[PDB]
Design a protein around this nucleic acid. Sequence first.
RNA 1: GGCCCCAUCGUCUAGCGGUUAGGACGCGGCCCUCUCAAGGCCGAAACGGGGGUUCGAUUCCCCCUGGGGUCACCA
Length: 468
Amino acid sequence: MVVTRIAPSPTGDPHVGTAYIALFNYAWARRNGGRFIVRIEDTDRARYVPGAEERILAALKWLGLSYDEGPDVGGPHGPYRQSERLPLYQKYAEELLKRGWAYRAFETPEELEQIRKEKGGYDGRARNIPPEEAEERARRGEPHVIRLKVPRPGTTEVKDELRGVVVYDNQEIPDVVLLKSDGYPTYHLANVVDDHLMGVTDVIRAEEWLVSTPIHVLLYRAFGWEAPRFYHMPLLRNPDKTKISKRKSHTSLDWYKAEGFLPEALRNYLCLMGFSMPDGREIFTLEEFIQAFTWERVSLGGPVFDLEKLRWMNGKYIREVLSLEEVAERVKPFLREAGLSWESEAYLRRAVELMRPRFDTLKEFPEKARYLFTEDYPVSEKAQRKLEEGLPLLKELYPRLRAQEEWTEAALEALLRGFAAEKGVKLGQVAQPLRAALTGSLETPGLFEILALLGKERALRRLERALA
RNA sequence: GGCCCCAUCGUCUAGCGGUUAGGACGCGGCCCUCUCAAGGCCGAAACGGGGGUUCGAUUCCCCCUGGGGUCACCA
Ligand SMILES: N[C@@H](CCC(=O)O)C(=O)O
Ligand SMILES: [Mg+2]
């Protein structure tokens, strides 16, 4: 059938490029009733960041993907972490040795650098070491690596399902290291051994791996295995069109979650990086995307990741996709983080409802509506000025307000409309200064709902401190 | 620099020989309105250049230019 996989390297924060590629793998697998695997590719102890693995696994789940096999969900072809499969690569590297498809090389990293400086790349000089001598030097413990013995001269065909066939000249393919001197495999060796053993049939990955594909075609040949299909997705880009990077863009999934972007929205945006619905619709579910996915609709240009459009979309989910109650639940962590509390569920829900069309990220909610949860709020200069100018009519309104028995948004509107009328002034002349009194801002939701929200007592108490 | 991939508004894109080249973000204007938003309407904004194929290129081919990727005992 169809088996796909995402194979993150635990060497930094959970990367958006990873979610992006994971998203297309997951969809292609489901669209085909196949399997979607997670394989942790921790073969480089130097760049290994302890804790990175858990973080990428949590971020994929957070984003909404599920995998069928992996480190924390089991599966028949585990382990799913390459550091625990060392003996396997070891074994396969040696089998290549016997088949005549690899050779041992003993140069120190220093000699290699020098070789590279003189000829710009390893010259395969170790191919000339007599096999029996190489074997003996190995038994004596002399440190070495095992390299791919590329067939020279020659030609190697790679087929990418989206771009067609590309024919590399073997002179462009290096005699790559397959097993390092510390006994760890390089990415090239492990990737082929594990995709095979875990049965992957469809390799969907970022374009940055395209030129390394001919090295993999050869390894599959060397082992006598059937190569899988290859689909290379365009790289996500920084605004300057270079591959998205930590210094020109936000590439950490943790940053996005911390900033209050909903996983559903981030996920919906990533689908738009290379894919589009037939009918041109832009807001759709994870499930709908799976059902409509087709490689015929994947475009190959490198998409600039636009934060502004992501925010637009996040605001769109907040106001049109999630329910009022869902938004209220998700806003809690940010209120907590801001050190604010809500009196009750009822209160929080109404507050979130009044602000729904005014925040594009969950983090923005506590910021723009701080006055709705604490007395410790800021009063802007423009608001303070509007307040001062309207103090006279506010003082004249106060008594009429402490008299209003029915504190409702309809009652209050009628009360204030009349007062402005009887005062021959425009409602705004009375609404704006009151808004400033109640919120310390001139940019808020409707005055009547703002006035109704806290109840007569709390409202006047605040109005009073302003008239003080 | 060698090799490889890519090419429609500033950005994400629709288009698979004939369209007033469409949508979305962002930008501007208007409407709504107690502020700010949200929403609605209108608007400005693209086929990189040169050859060919063809009755007819945004679309098929070549070159160029442009952009990107890749050349580690990193992934
Ligand atoms: N570990 C590789 C895996 C890429 C692949 O072959 O899918 C990475 O950087 O994601
Ligand atoms: Mg136009």
